[PDB]
Amino acid sequence: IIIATKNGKVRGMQLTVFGGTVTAFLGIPYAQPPLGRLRFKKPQSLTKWSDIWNATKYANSCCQNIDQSFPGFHGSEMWNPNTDLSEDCLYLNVWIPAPKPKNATVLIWIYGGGFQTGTSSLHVYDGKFLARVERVIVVSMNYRVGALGFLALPGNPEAPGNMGLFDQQLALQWVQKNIAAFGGNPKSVTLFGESAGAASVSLHLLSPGSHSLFTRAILQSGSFNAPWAVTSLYEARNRTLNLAKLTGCSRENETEIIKCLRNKDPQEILLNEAFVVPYGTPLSVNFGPTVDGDFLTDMPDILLELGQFKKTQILVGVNKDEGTAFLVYGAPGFSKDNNSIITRKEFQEGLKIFFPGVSEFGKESILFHYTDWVDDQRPENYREALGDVVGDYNFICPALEFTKKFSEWGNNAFFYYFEHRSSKLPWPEWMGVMHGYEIEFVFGLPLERRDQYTKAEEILSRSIVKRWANFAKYGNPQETQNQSTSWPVFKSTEQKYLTLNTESTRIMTKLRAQQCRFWTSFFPKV
Ligand SMILES: *[C@@H]1O[C@H](CO[C@@H]2O[C@@H](C)[C@@H](O)[C@@H](O)[C@@H]2O)[C@@H](O[C@@H]2O[C@H](CO)[C@@H](O)[C@H](O)[C@H]2NC(C)=O)[C@H](O)[C@H]1NC(C)=O
Numbered sequence: 001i002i003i004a005t006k007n008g009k010v011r012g013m014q015l016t017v018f019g020g021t022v023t024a025f026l027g028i029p030y031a032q033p034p035l036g037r038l039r040f041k042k043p044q045s046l047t048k049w050s051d052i053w054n055a056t057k058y059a060n061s062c063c064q065n066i067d068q069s070f071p072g073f074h075g076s077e078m079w080n081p082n083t084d085l086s087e088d089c090l091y092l093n094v095w096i097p098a099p100k101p102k103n104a105t106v107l108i109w110i111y112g113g114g115f116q117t118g119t120s121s122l123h124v125y126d127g128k129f130l131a132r133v134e135r136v137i138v139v140s141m142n143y144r145v146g147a148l149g150f151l152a153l154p155g156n157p158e159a160p161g162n163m164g165l166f167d168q169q170l171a172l173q174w175v176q177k178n179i180a181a182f183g184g185n186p187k188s189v190t191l192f193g194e195s196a197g198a199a200s201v202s203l204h205l206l207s208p209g210s211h212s213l214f215t216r217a218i219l220q221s222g223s224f225n226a227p228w229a230v231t232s233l234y235e236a237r238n239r240t241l242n243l244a245k246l247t248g249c250s251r252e253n254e255t256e257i258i259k260c261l262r263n264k265d266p267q268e269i270l271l272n273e274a275f276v277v278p279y280g281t282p283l284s285v286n287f288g289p290t291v292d293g294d295f296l297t298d299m300p301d302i303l304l305e306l307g308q309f310k311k312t313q314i315l316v317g318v319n320k321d322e323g324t325a326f327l328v329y330g331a332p333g334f335s336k337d338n339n340s341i342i343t344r345k346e347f348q349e350g351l352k353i354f355f356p357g358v359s360e361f362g363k364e365s366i367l368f369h370y371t372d373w374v375d376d377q378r379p380e381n382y383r384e385a386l387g388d389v390v391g392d393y394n395f396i397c398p399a400l401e402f403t404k405k406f407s408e409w410g411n412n413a414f415f416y417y418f419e420h421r422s423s424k425l426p427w428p429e430w431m432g433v434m435h436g437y438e439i440e441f442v443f444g445l446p447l448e449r450r451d452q453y454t455k456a457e458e459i460l461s462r463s464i465v466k467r468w469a470n471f472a473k474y475g476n477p478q479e480t481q482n483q484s485t486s487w488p489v490f491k492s493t494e495q496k497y498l499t500l501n502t503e504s505t506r507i508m509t510k511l512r513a514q515q516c517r518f519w520t521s522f523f524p525k526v
């Protein structure tokens with residue numbers, strides 16, 4: 001219940017899980033609160049305390065804008081923060097098996113949320129099941145999002161960019177220096193994350209300051225080469241200045257701009273984040289990772305292509321319907337409360353929504369490659385095409401291109417295609433296997449029988465949890481005891497992947513081959 005860390009003693013709490021016990025330390029601080037003069041700076045190291053920090057409840061989530069699009073609807077509100085928002089949010093959580101393990105493998109979760117939202121205290125990120133079932137230690141941290149995490153005046157240390165990434169990094173450092181005291185093995189640390197968390201994971205594979213802070217990596221529904229994941233220096237500076245103008249902070253001395261922004265209330269900053277771009281989309285990442293010359297020393301596409309990344313094993317995957325979640329945030333004709341049959345004209349309007357800065361010819365090229373039908377008369381054709389357009393462009397084809405490029409430098413890589421729709425999914429049926437709804441299976445929520453999942457879903461979560469644990473401990477995501485399908489490595493030639501479902505788990509080849517040749521080879525030219 002009392003662990004001695006290098007900055008002071010922390011008290012945890014006992015959780016009863018599946019007739020066993022897990023020790024949770026919720027809300028350990030891992031940096032100086034980035035407040036006052038420290039707003040927009042890289043996280044500063046923490047000063048020793050002499051009392052017993054009571055790590056007995058989740059800490060503040062970082063300041064962020066809330067999804068208010070569907071008040072009272074669990075499908076959206078399950079992602080909104082469930083603790084107070086504050087700038088004082090650089091805290092992390094540890095779940096250790098009980099009895100305290102000897103040399104446990106460590107899983108570090110990095111949440112997504114488009115680099116603008118997210119918190120580690122969400123119900124679907126509860127690491128106690130993994131600590132109970134697989135006897136790993138699960139760590140998760142809060143890191144700054146939006147402008148407070150990623151405002152960029154490149155080269156200027158008052159606002160250098162990538163601060164939320166450096167938050168993630170300082171937490172990884174904390175695990176290196178302290179996790180042995182919890183029974184963890186600092187030499188067996190696997191990062192995993194979803195969406196922007198997955199893009200975050202992939203960027204730690206590229207950052208030299210992260211090389212020695214983890215062993216292996218898991219990327220769920222995201223990678224740095226996704227089109228939303230990295231902001232250019234020109235965009236980043238134009239957005240910093242547009243924020244300055246919007247807050248009355250325009251100055252000629254760039255440091256005076258930052259100091260001005262330091263006296264604004266977080267709410268002033270949050271309110272104006274949405275407007276630093278002239279045309280947004282449901283996938284806008286207004287303030288995100290940039291090439292700062294510190295965390296990121298060059299354009300990550302160049303680093304990937306030329307093999308400049310940590311050489312290790314990766315597990316990468318995507319969900320069958322990544323794109324549908326974003327259609328009900330602006331695409332015309334779409335609604336979670338009907339079946340969203342749209343017309344050709346609504347489809348064309350939807351491309352304007354999702355590709356506003358793209359030429360007419362670019363948008364016609366999407367239409368041409370996605371509207372050659374197996375049946376001109378299926379009424380869901382355009383509804384499903386727009387989902388696939390958004391899913392393939394933003395998630396699936398970048399994840400596949402990342403995995404090809406990464407594996408060509410010699411490392412084992414494993415790719416999955418998650419195609420199970422949760423029986424408890426609150427969103428409608430036409431949205432399918434949505435973005436983010438593999439996470440509850442990874443964290444083992446269906447292992448709780450009291451929670452209305454089916455038996456087939458319990459079995460699927462059990463096999464997924466074991467494959468993820470075996471990947472973390474041993475670099476190999478097999479389930480070896482229950483005559484399971486062997487998961488083959490993904491190679492750039494054959495491109496084998498494993499499907500995850502309740503019925504039959506299958507080895508397939510060349511996911512979205514026709515679609516990704518469009519997105520990866522044609523569309524970037526437009
Ligand atoms: C770089 O930013 C400018 C300025 O953006 C405007 O001011 C901000 C404070 C905010 O309110 C934005 O929404 C404003 O648009 C962009 O210039 C605008 O571009 C649009 C269309 O491109 C045009 O209709 C507006 O009149 C422009 N406004 C001004 C003041 O020039 C500019 O496009 C940005 N560059 C890029 C590449 O996005």
Ligand SMILES: *[C@@H]1O[C@H](CO[C@@H]2O[C@@H](C)[C@@H](O)[C@@H](O)[C@@H]2O)[C@@H](O[C@@H]2O[C@H](CO)[C@@H](O)[C@H](O)[C@H]2NC(C)=O)[C@H](O)[C@H]1NC(C)=O
Binds near residue numbers: 333338
């Ligand atoms: C599905 O619903 C959308 C969204 O419309 C809203 O939600 C519905 C559930 C219902 O309560 C509507 O009255 C709401 O307006 C419909 O798209 C709208 O259609 C109207 C028709 O008058 C159009 O003027 C609006 O601009 C549309 N709104 C949006 C956001 O696109 C859509 O037609 C419905 N589709 C089907 C097949 O029923």
Ligand SMILES: C#CCN1CC[C@H](CN(CCCOC)S(=O)(=O)c2ccc3ccccc3c2)C1
Binds near residue numbers: 114115282283
């Ligand atoms: C269900 C559900 C959650 N919804 C799914 C979509 C919604 C987008 N959000 C902002 C909400 C308001 O604006 C549209 S978001 O979480 O902040 C966001 C923003 C940009 C992103 C870019 C790439 C990948 C994920 C991103 C996430 C949130």
Ligand SMILES: *[C@@H]1O[C@H](CO[C@@H]2O[C@@H](C)[C@@H](O)[C@@H](O)[C@@H]2O)[C@@H](O)[C@H](O)[C@H]1NC(C)=O
Binds near residue numbers: 054
């Ligand atoms: C930190 O916690 C200390 C002990 O908390 C109490 O005792 C333990 C054994 C549990 O039963 C726990 O639930 C109890 O609340 C407090 O004495 C101390 O004041 C706390 N420090 C704070 C709140 O700053």
Ligand SMILES: *[C@@H]1O[C@H](CO[C@@H]2O[C@@H](C)[C@@H](O)[C@@H](O)[C@@H]2O)[C@@H](O)[C@H](O)[C@H]1NC(C)=O
Binds near residue numbers: 188
């Ligand atoms: C804990 O275990 C260490 C070795 O870890 C193993 O080797 C490294 C290189 C990784 O591949 C990792 O996944 C493996 O589990 C030992 O060196 C160390 O002394 C051990 N310490 C204690 C206290 O148990």
Ligand SMILES: *[C@@H]1O[C@H](CO[C@@H]2O[C@@H](C)[C@@H](O)[C@@H](O)[C@@H]2O)[C@@H](O)[C@H](O)[C@H]1NC(C)=O
Binds near residue numbers: 466
């Ligand atoms: C493996 O399966 C266990 C129970 O499965 C049953 O017993 C085994 C021995 C076989 O006969 C099997 O076909 C039966 O259905 C589960 O309790 C266990 O959690 C499973 N483990 C994993 C890692 O998926």
Ligand SMILES: *[C@@H]1O[C@H](CO)[C@@H](O)[C@H](O)[C@H]1NC(C)=O
Binds near residue numbers: 253254255256
């Ligand atoms: C901006 O002001 C800072 C001190 O606040 C100073 O170090 C810097 O050189 C100034 N730059 C100018 C005036 O261009």
Ligand SMILES: [Cl-]
Binds near residue numbers: 522
């Ligand atoms: Cl083509």
